[PDB]
Amino acid sequence: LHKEPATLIKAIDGDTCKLMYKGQPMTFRLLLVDTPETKHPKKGVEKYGPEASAFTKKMVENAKKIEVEFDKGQRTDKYGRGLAYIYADGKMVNEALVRQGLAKVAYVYKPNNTHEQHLRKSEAQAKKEKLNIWS
Ligand SMILES: Cc1cn([C@H]2C[C@H](OP(=O)(O)O)[C@@H](COP(=O)(O)O)O2)c(=O)[nH]c1=O
Ligand SMILES: [Ca+2]
């Protein structure tokens, strides 16, 4: 897995943001995780959704540099969103959210699961510390 540079265009919510990648604007969806909904009416504004968005927004907006790391499987989903692990100054946003109890490990589709165990151990810690979603 190789990391690549990207430029923040705009954070949309907890697990989705728009980045300029290879000179092209794209919406990215964080791999292996799911932050609560704040958009789709079929779900509504789920508890901790606004919090997860604020965390992600803060994290990506304050970074000196952003990198995207694709897994080994497909790089986009059916909606055309780039599927990656996003890093803000070397810190993985996907793991950060799970560690704070602001996201649950979800959508694990082989072979795009290289970091599954790492995220699972962080989720177990958030759970034991009874953080946010796990409170
Ligand atoms: C994280 C991820 C989501 N998805 C899909 C599954 C869901 O399909 P459906 O929308 O048809 O349920 C949706 C979840 O994303 P959101 O959390 O952004 O809604 O995106 C993938 O296909 N692959 C992925 O790797
Ligand atoms: Ca979501």
Whole-number Å distance between alpha carbons of 49 and 135 = 14
Technique used by the depositors: X-ray
- DSSP alpha helices (H): ranges in 87-129? 93-99, 116-128
81 is catalytic: yes
- Half-sphere exposure of residue 105: CA atoms within 13 angstroms, side-chain side: 20
Indicate the CATH number for domain 1-135.
2.40.50.90
Please tell me the number of Cα atoms within 13 Å of 98 on its side-chain side: 25
- CA dist 135 and 133 (Å) reads 6
The domain ranges of the chain are 1-135
Question: Strand, helix or coil at 54?
Answer: helix
Q: Is 35 annotated in some ligand binding site?
A: yes
Give the closest residue (by CA) to ligand 1 atom 1: 31
- Ligand 1 centre to CA of 106 (Å) is 9
Name the active-site residue from 69, 81, 116, 120: 81
Active site residue 29: yes
Say which ligand is closest to the CA of 81: 1
Query: Of ligand 1's atoms, which has the minimum distance to the CA of residue 78?
Result: 22
